[PDB]
């Protein structure tokens with residue numbers, strides 16, 4: 001029952017500062033413009049200890065499966081090859097990605113009927129809000 005409140009099908013309803021977050025990550029102009037239009041559906045499921053997060057959009061379809069605390073390789077939507085570790089910290093899913101000596105952290109939390117995602121790269125934060133689909 002670890003992540004029960006995350007499980008489901010979620011649709012992006014708002015975004016703030018995502019272009020600036022992507023710039024800070026190192027994403028180039030064309031990917032920023034096209035990726036920034038996307039309205040992904042995020043599908044979260046749990047089977048035993050394995051959590052799966054799928055993201056489906058017009059730009060890319062991705063999928064990650066993982067066990068909490070156990071590092072895995074991820075190819076991101078913007079084509080970074082990263083080493084990821086996802087943990088639960090006080091009810092927040094905390095996802096750290098490492099690549100090329102860099103690091104970014106993505107936090108996912110339940111707030112009211114929403115799933116709120118905070119993406120941080122150095123001093124730049126983007127907030128992405130999802131509703132049930």
Ligand SMILES: O=C(O)[C@@H]1[C@@H]2CC[C@@H](C2)[C@H]1c1nc2ccccc2s1
Nearest residue numbers: 022025035038040055057059077078
């Ligand atoms: O999952 C998402 O919400 C988005 C949208 C759906 C697919 C693309 C656009 C994905 C990105 N994530 C990142 C992370 C860092 C840098 C660039 C990008 S594009």
